[PDB]
Design a protein around this ligand. Sequence first.
Ligand SMILES: [Zn+2]
Ligand SMILES: [Zn+2]
Lengths: 77, 410
Amino acid sequence: ALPKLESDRARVPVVGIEAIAPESRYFNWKEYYTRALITLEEPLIDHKFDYGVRGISRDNFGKINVESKVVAPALRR
Amino acid sequence: GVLPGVLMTREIAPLVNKIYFQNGANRGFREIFNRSQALNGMGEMAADLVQVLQKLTLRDDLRFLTMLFWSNILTPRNLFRTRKAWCPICYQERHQNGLVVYEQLLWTINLITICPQHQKPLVELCPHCNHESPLLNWRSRPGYCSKCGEWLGANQCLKTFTDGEGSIKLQLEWQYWTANVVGELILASQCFESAPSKENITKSLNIVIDKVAENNAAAFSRLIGVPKNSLWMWQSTKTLPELNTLLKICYELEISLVEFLTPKNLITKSFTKISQKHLQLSRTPRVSPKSFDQYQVKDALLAILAGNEEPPPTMEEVGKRLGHHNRTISRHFPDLCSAISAKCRNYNKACRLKSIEKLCSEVREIVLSLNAQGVYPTEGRVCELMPNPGCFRYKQVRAAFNDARREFGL
DNA sequence: CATCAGTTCGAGTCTGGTACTGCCCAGTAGTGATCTTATTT
DNA sequence: AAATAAGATCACTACTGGGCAGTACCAGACTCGAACTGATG
Ligand SMILES: [Zn+2]
Ligand SMILES: [Zn+2]
């Protein structure tokens, strides 16, 4: 995908995370969504997709920040 | 655990028995913070603060922290800074070593520029915010900015001298000498049995003039580089020279300030270098003794007093219109000055009273209009319908709002 | 005599001691909905 | 294991302290233009 990345921007070839064993009894889908969004959304800061959920935006250093106020369905969206 | 402004307003202001101290404890004592340079000074405010702090703390050595010992020997002209000066290296060293962080009195003298202990200059601006800070403020903290509340100490000073080997080294040596002399002066403030008087300066001048200029004030004045009229002002009248002039004289004589103040050690010495060194030839003089006629100023001020204008000007406006200085006018005519100042003050008081009674009237009218539509009248909702939604800080606008709500049942 | 040093008068400039104006924000205690965790049967 | 409690958190609302950038005044005081006047080589 290197020629495609050079020709077309805002497209990540492959994204991969590893599932987390939850601290609690049940699997944490909230943390899964947060970590997937963090890992996927690390291109150059030029690609500002301004997700339609408030509470997920860029910062001064270009990292992804998500506060605890964002609910799991909003993270999934 | 309280802010210094809160402590002064709620515990130090009531104890003092001055009108502006009791009246300023319910409004924000900005008078004592805009003029905090005189709290460490030789004046009456410093003495009163020392006495009230002594009463609050039951201490006996608080007068050493000020210059009240040097009241009759030192003048307040150019002696104290307007802004806080600190050595960041001093703060960092005191905090790292576990010692308490404190502000020394030596930093409060304008003549001092660099810290003798650390060989770096005193920084007078917060590194994080380029904002000036007074000596004492509402949110003052030892080592923290009184405007942003962040640490002011650093391992290395952020200000560095320019690259120059012509006069920078000489200026640095001069600054070190002044720092050492002023520090030793402060140290000797406690050792002396009694405060030296002004007549010590006269006796010292009588010795040095006879010893270097063979009883000639003009030659001495030319040597140091200050006008001979000021020498006459000093040596035969009760006028105390500024600390800068005394330090310059002592530097030219190689004899320290404390050794110059004593009239005994001056007798047994034979200065020779003072004649050798003289580097004061080009000094910029004052502008001019501008003309001042009693008849013209008196007629103009009588006309402005009789003439009714709106609103009645303050005296700075009158002086600026005349292109003069306030002190020059007030020296000859202090009575009509007070008359004009009064007229303006009563006009301002009447205007404030009428405007604020009106503001209460609109407050009542707005609460009427808001309760007419059924919406709950709160302070914020009423504030949203006012040109200046801050008038409730007055403690009768809020009273009128509360009375109007309680009459209506809230 | 004309040059220079000791003397007065008064304005430029500081500065403390005293007094007062004009305006909104913040900290806190409630309720209501909605998690997240914790006891019952 | 399902059902029932209960604390935590977010969000909004109403209430009540309460201070800072800024102006103003009043003589006391220092410093030195500008000049006045007397001794002197
Ligand atoms: Zn230091
Ligand atoms: Zn700061």
